[PDB]
Design a protein around this ligand. Structure first.
Ligand SMILES: [Mg+2]
Ligand SMILES: [Mg+2]
Lengths: 132, 131, 101, 138, 196, 100, 154
């Protein structure tokens, strides 16, 4: 049987998100892409460096906002800019969010040598697409 | 006022710290998205449009005749013989190379000049007079 | 802090091959010709063979940058077939989708 | 009721040197999504009409690069997975521009280039015969 | 007690407002700012598409909310002061090649990333018809033998492509220089030419 | 297999376009290809193949001791390494090991 | 026949952005741009408005502290063109020798204590000190009042 990126059915008590409920054969039919850049286009270059930056960002943000991320990130590149769009929870205090936004935006700008901006969208609870 | 002040003299600490107080009166937080882009562009973080792939890269102000015409550096070599033919091929490829600078192309040539000065005794057995 | 020692040995090889790249280039030019004397070409055969082994570019291996896997590596992403699919199957690689036709 | 009584506009000085001419300006944008290109076309075409520029649009054929990989971590050769990257094109052929007009239009659309969309701008400049070419010296 | 979120500011918006002021530049989809009941997603059995609140699919879209027709027309009205007028004389292409017989091509590449470099930007192409040059029978016959496959007899166009030097200004100079030494050598007559 | 006029004309075109002038065999034309291109070892895909794992691992190790990054993986293996001390399965002293 | 070619127009690299910003106005339904456009993160009261920017400014200082304390992690430069404003700053003196040029480097970094304690050593040795160098030390001392400038952390 196939296993990649599939959430196995259960009794019915397990909540899943939209992206987590669709398998790889829906990535261009019912889902989009979590990262958007030009590396993988025909005739373009530096697709390998853009991938290592993505892998590091998803981990930097998972450990920098522990227990706060409601769903996967959405990385966007428009020229020199790098826009990180995240959906976070409302448990943490806003004072601590503004601290981490300025700490991460700055640390990542000096690391990758690019202007970085972070966009948060708070939700009360993790959105549920269905129950498996 | 005075026609010519002491422009050569550099501002003192009192003048450098007073100019930082005049840049704070007009200091205000970013009011819109456009202003952020403007601030970044002035600092140098954001690219200047329209896009130029050669931005910030001038190869030491070198003209095309410094990359393609390298037989000016072959004046310390035999004018005729195998060394000339060989060194006429090195400079032909060095002329077709857009990945090197003129400062790097001369290094290659100077290395051969010094290399043939150490092999003089070996070039005499083959009847080759290098300097 | 690399994945394994096999990876670490390749990092050193790519560093030593970058320092001697020009010296090896200039010497090979003498060998790859029928113009210069055989006596001189024989001396260049010994000078480039006396350079350290790790300076030779053929001793470099394109391993995966995440798992250090020597085989099954895609050169465009520098990843192994197993890691590439893990990111592509989760929609983390821009433009990559599954093929059907 | 609150509105800036006066507005400041960026200074545009006129130079003495002559301006550059462009017989054609070919803009080729790539992307993985077609609706993002159909939407970028509508924006780039409408921005040309308001600036007084001639523009023609055509859609070059797409390119699909495929490749296959093993399905399992160990053995099971027969069973593999195939992937593809789809590259869609959209060419915007402008005509009869100047250096300044193209400098403005390009900056306007390059900045608003959406995510996952590249661009190849081919500029066809008009020049005159050099002085040395007018007559022979020999 | 716990801090509660304020209601979305879409309710305070009026219908006859100025949208460009809300989305002046490119920005991600903010459901608390976009006053549209837009939905996205594949519905479950006897269900409806997911709402915009918390939807990641709408965040993945590169929206065009900052480029509404109202803004475009308003943006370009302020950009007409940077533009120049095209010579009315040069109406057609046949008249452009009579005063400007040379055409220089050069390509610029725009790609995401921290580096803007691209080695494909150094290339320069120079095209010119031989009918616009002051050549005679001999010079023209000799020029076509030097350039080789760079000349197309069907179109009578000489194409010079230069990608030797790092920068694009150098290759431009190289191409003009090549056109010059070709023109003059073509006019020059040598002794060996007699043995044709 | 060329006429004298064609040979002396081709030799001239080569001089103009900066190509090889002297008659050279295929073996010796590799010297032109060795210096007209950048060697494989100096290409950026070769010497910058790997990302510097020292920086990534040393940076995030420091950020964890500073309290700014939470590594769920170190916490896992730090809890296991703490339960093996209570069970007696502790790493021995170097040199003074079980063997001698 | 002669065709009149138009004159070339020039402008600054930010001129096209200032013309587009002149086409918009303040959004009445929104809070200042600097804040996060989100109901839970929007400042309700005036105290939040000021305490929310002081916390975001505090994260920028915590990152600069880490960037200047461990420069080696951020030295790798991949940007083209180079961005000088995104590279670690070096506040420590590099010329460890005692000379006239080694004191000038400690005056440009505003090292009051090190420069004065090192000026005595240079003066004790008897080496001639230029009057343009001793005048540059007075300015550093007359301004701060023989006290060290403020720093992120000691
Ligand atoms: Mg199967
Ligand atoms: Mg091999």
């Amino acid at each position: 049987k196939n296993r990649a990126a599939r959430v196995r059915v259960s009794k019915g008590d397990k909540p899943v998100t939209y992206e987590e409920a669709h398998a790889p054969h829906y990535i261009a039919h019912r889902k989009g892409w979590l990262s958007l850049h030009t590396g993988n286009l025909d005739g373009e270059d530096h697709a390998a460096e853009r991938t290592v930056e993505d892998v590091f960002l998803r981990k930097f943000m998972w450990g920098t906002f522990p227990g706060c991320l409601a769903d996967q990130l959405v990385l966007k590149r428009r020229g020199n800019q790098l826009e990180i769009c995240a959906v976070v929870l409302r448990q943490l205090s806003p004072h601590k969010y503004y601290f981490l936004v300025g700490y991460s935006e700055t640390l990542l700008s000096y690391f990758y040598k690019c202007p970085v901006r972070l966009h948060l969208q708070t939700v009360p609870s993790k959105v549920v697409y269905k129950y498996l | 006022t005075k026609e010519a002040p002491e422009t050569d003299t550099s501002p003192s600490l009192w003048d450098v710290e007073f100019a930082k107080q005049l840049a704070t009166v007009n200091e205000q937080p970013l009011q819109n998205g456009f202003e952020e882009l403007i601030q970044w562009t002035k600092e140098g973080k954001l690219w200047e449009f329209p896009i130029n792939n050669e931005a910030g890269f001038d190869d030491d102000g070198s003209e095309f005749h410094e990359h393609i015409f390298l037989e000016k550096h072959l004046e310390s070599f035999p004018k005729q013989g195998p060394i000339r033919h060989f060194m006429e091929l090195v400079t032909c490829g060095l002329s077709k190379n857009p990945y090197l600078s003129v400062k790097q192309k001369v290094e290659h040539i100077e290395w051969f000049r010094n290399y043939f000065n150490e092999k003089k005794d070996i070039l005499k057995e083959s009847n080759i007079q290098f300097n | 802090h690399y994945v394994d020692w096999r990876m670490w040995r390749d990092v050193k090889r790519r560093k030593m091959a970058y320092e001697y790249a020009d010296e090896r280039l200039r010497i090979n030019s003498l060998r790859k010709n029928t113009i210069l004397p055989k006596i001189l070409q024989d001396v260049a055969d010994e000078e480039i063979a006396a350079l350290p082994r790790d300076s030779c570019p053929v001793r470099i291996r394109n391993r995966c940058v995440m798992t250090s896997r020597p085989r099954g590596v895609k050169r465009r992403w520098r990843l192994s077939r197993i890691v590439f699919r893990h990111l592509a199957d989760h929609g983390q690689l821009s433009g990559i989708q599954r093929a059907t036709w | 009721v609150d509105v800036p009584k006066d507005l400041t506009k960026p200074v545009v000085t006129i130079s003495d040197e002559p301006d550059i001419l462009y017989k054609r300006l070919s803009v080729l944008v790539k992307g993985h999504d077609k609706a993002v290109l159909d939407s970028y076309e509508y924006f780039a075409v409408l921005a040309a009409k308001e600036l007084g520029i001639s523009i023609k649009v055509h859609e070059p054929p797409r390119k699909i690069e495929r490749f296959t990989l093993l399905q399992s971590v160990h053995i099971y050769k027969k069973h593999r997975v195939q992937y593809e990257m789809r590259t869609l094109y959209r060419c915007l052929e402008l005509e009869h521009l100047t250096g300044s007009t193209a400098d403005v239009y390009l900056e306007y659309i390059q900045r608003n280039l959406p995510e996952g969309v590249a661009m190849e701008v081919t500029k066809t400049q008009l020049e005159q015969l050099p002085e040395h070419i007018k007559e022979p010296i020999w | 007690p716990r801090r509660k979120a304020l209601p979305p500011r879409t309710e305070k918006m009026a219908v006859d407002q100025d949208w460009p002021s809300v989305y002046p530049v490119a920005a991600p989809f903010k459901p608390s700012a976009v006053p549209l009941p837009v939905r996205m997603g594949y519905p479950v059995k006897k269900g409806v598409p997911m709402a915009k609140e918390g939807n990641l699919e709408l965040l993945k879209i590169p929206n065009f909310l900052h480029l509404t027709p109202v803004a475009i027309k308003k943006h370009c009205e302020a950009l007409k002061d940077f533009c120049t007028e095209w010579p009315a004389a040069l109406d057609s292409d046949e008249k452009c090649e009579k005063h400007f017989p040379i055409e220089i091509d050069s390509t610029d590449y725009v790609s995401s990333g921290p580096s803007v470099r691209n080695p494909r930007a150094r290339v320069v192409v120079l095209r010119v018809k031989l009918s616009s040059l002051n050549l005679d029978d001999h010079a023209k016959k000799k020029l076509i033998k030097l350039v080789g496959e760079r000349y197309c007899k069907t179109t009578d166009v000489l194409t010079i492509k230069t990608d030797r030097c790092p920068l694009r200004r150098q290759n431009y100079d190289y191409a003009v220089y090549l056109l010059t030494v070709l023109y003059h050598e073509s006019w020059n007559t040598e002794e060996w030419e007699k043995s044709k | 297999s060329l006429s004298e006029y064609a040979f002396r004309m081709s030799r001239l075109s080569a001089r103009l376009f900066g190509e090889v002038t002297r008659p050279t065999n295929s073996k010796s034309m590799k010297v032109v290809k060795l210096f007209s291109e950048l060697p494989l070892a100096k290409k950026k895909e070769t010497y910058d193949w790997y990302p510097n794992h020292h920086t990534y691992a040393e940076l995030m190790q420091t950020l964890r001791f500073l309290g700014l990054y939470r590594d769920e993986h170190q916490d896992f293996m730090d809890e296991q390494k703490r339960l093996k001390k209570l069970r007696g399965k502790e790493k021995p002293k170097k040199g003074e090991g079980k063997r001698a | 026949e002669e065709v009149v070619i138009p004159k070339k127009k020039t402008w600054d690299k930010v001129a096209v952005l200032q013309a587009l910003a002149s086409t918009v106005n303040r959004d009445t339904t929104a809070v200042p741009y600097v804040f996060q456009d989100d109901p839970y993160l929007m400042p309700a009261s005036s105290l939040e408005s000021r305490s929310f920017l002081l916390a975001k400014k505090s994260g920028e200082n915590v990152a600069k502290f880490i960037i200047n304390s461990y420069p080696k992690y951020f030295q790798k430069d991949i940007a083209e063109p180079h961005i000088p404003c995104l590279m670690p700053e070096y506040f420590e003196p590099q010329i460890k020798d005692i000379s006239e040029a080694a004191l000038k480097e400690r005056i440009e970094l505003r090292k009051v204590k090190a420069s004065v304690d090192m000026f005595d050593q240079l003066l004790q040795a008897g080496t001639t000190v230029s009057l343009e160098t001793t005048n540059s030390l007075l300015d550093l001392l007359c301004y701060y009042g023989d006290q060290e400038p403020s720093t992120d952390y000691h």
